[PDB]
């Protein structure tokens, strides 16, 4: 559909994630790196929403 | 030529010069004596102002009938010695007699609520001291009417004052430099004293307040011989517009005219009736024409308690002399049309104006008509108000959604289906009478009566294109809307 750049194309994808996922749940989805220092990761959404944002 | 981006084909420009008065004599010592100079101070302008009397003249006149009450209405006009402003005459006349006699300059500020005799008595001040100047006990002066609401632009007062002083037509930016050079630089031996009346000073100062400063600052000059009688409405108009340090520098007098009392209204109305009250006319019985001293010798007295209650009611509200002279003029033509209907004169023992003629003349300007208007609307228009009043007692929100009004009208015909009037009208209000028209969402003439109440001013409606969520206020009151709907027979039972 578009002739956008390869990083313009991932920057609309990240724009579509930021604008429909909520900011509260982002640490549960995207975090991958091991913890040197003790801490608890985000638990995620507990129940699904039936609005389809 | 070039291709223009837009056109102005109705420009009409005045033949007004651009150079001010400070650049046509090259020296203050070369300025001549301006009083003994032909085009200054209006010595040739008395020909063109009298041109327009001949335009409205026609030679036909066929014996117009002048009855008893026509002479009273002619004498109660506002255009026709004044009793109740004596200390205010003696304050304006004393302040202006001293400044003309001493070749000085001052400003007199006079305010008050509308209609209290202040434009009348300032003109009566300057007419007294024209007669004093014509007898040579004060020097000659020149008098300029400036009315702020008789101007198109606020800046036209500079043009009209400098035109009356000098006979020259300049633009306004050239007229204020012409006037400012005139008042501070031209010597006092060469000028004449000028009494300018800045009437209705509210209207000139609404946008930029640059105009009230100049006329008052010109009076502080030594060489200026300028008396500004500035008549406005409120008393704080100098201190709000100019400030506190400017209005203390000018040092003007400050008069307020209080509205008249009821005993002062009686000595205005009965003062304009001294030649006609308790007097004899000659009325012929076949045309109706009266002649002051086939024909009866009728006479005319007006009741003194009729003038009393016309004075007690007008002075208690505003106190102006116009509303009392035209509540007695209105009473004099109510009494005429009954005299005109009994005898049938038309147009070609004792007469009186009762207490009931003055009360009838006074009640019609104090009554409201939103009661009488809404009792005689349609059933559809009264059903719109009656549904709106039910919504303002379910919520009290006092602006109802217009789709909540539509569902209320439908619910009110829903519930009252046993009613004798509602069974026979609901056929003629959803299908409009006959078959072949479907049952519909709005009642018949819903767009007619919603626009009828918005045009009348009863109803306020906000601007939304969604015709259902739009909001609707009243503009009259909730009480006088309920008073009009508890009178109608069919709505108060349901």
């Amino acid at each position: 559909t578009y002739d956008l750049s390869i990083i313009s194309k991932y920057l609309l994808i990240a724009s579509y994630i930021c604008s429909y996922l909520e900011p509260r749940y982002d640490a549960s989805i995207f975090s991958r790196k091991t913890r040197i220092i003790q801490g608890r990761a985000a638990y995620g959404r507990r129940k699904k929403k039936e609005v389809n944002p | 030529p070039v291709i223009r981006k837009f056109t102005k084909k109705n420009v009409a420009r005045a033949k007004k010069k651009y150079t001010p008065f400070s650049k046509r004599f090259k020296s203050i010592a070369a300025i001549p004596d301006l009083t003994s100079l032909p085009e200054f101070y209006g010595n040739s302008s008395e020909l063109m102002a009298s041109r327009f009397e001949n335009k409205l003249k026609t030679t036909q006149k066929h014996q117009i009938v002048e009855t008893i009450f026509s002479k009273v209405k002619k004498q109660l006009n506002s255009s026709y010695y004044l009793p109740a402003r004596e200390n205010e005459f003696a304050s304006i006349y004393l302040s202006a007699y001293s400044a003309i006699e001493s070749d000085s300059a001052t400003t007199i500020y006079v305010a008050g609520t509308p209609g209290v005799g202040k434009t009348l008595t300032v003109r009566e001040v300057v007419k007294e001291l024209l007669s004093s100047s014509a007898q040579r006990e004060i020097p000659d002066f020149l008098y300029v009417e400036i009315n702020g609401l008789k101007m198109v632009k606020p800046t036209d007062c500079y043009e009209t004052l400098w035109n009356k002083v000098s006979g020259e037509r300049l633009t306004w930016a050239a007229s204020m430099e012409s006037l400012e050079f005139y008042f501070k630089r031209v010597p006092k031996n060469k000028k004449k004293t000028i009494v300018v009346l800045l009437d209705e000073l509210d209207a000139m100062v609404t946008k930029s307040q640059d105009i009230m400063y100049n006329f008052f600052n010109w009076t502080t000059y030594e060489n200026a011989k300028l008396i500004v009688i500035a008549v406005a409405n409120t008393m704080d108009l100098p201190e709000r517009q100019l400030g506190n340090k400017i209005t203390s520098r000018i040092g003007f007098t400050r008069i307020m005219f209080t509205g008249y009392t009821h005993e002062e209204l009686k000595n205005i109305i009965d003062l304009r009736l001294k030649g006609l009250n308790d007097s004899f006319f000659y009325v012929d019985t076949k045309t109706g024409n009266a002649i002051l001293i086939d024909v009866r010798k009728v006479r005319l007295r007006m009741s003194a308690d009729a003038i009393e209650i016309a004075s007690r009611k007008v002075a208690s509200v505003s106190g102006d002399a116009r509303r009392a002279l035209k509540v007695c003029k209105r009473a004099a033509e109510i009494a005429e049309k009954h005299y005109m209907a009994k005898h049938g004169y038309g147009y070609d023992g004792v007469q009186t104006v009762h207490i009931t003629h003055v009360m009838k003349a006074l009640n019609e300007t104090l009554n409201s008509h939103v009661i009488t208007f809404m009792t005689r609307l349609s059933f559809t228009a009264k059903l719109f108000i009656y549904a709106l009043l039910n919504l303002m007692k379910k919520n009290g929100s006092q602006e109802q959604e217009l789709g909540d009004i539509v569902d209320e009208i439908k619910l009110l015909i829903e519930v009252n289906g046993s009613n004798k009037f509602v069974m026979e009208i609901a056929k003629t209000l959803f299908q409009q009478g006959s078959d072949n028209i479907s049952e519909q969402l709005r009642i018949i003439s819903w767009d007619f009566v919603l626009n009828q109440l918005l045009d009348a001013g009863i109803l306020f409606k906000q601007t939304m294109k969604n015709d259902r969520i739009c909001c609707v206020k009243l503009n009259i009151s909730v009480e006088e809307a309920k008073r009009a709907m508890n009178e109608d027979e069919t709505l108060r039972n349901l």
Partner: protein, 53 residues
Amino acid sequence: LHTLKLIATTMNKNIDYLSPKVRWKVNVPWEIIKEISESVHFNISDYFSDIHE
């Protein structure tokens, strides 16, 4: 991506990019960002499958 009207802002005349108050949002439909995600072999539907679909 903002001059192409693919990222939107709050509408004020002469917004400044360089300000704390200015927030951003995407304006492309789902049917465009689905065509975008299959080009870079990114599975954006799994980020939205777990919220309601």
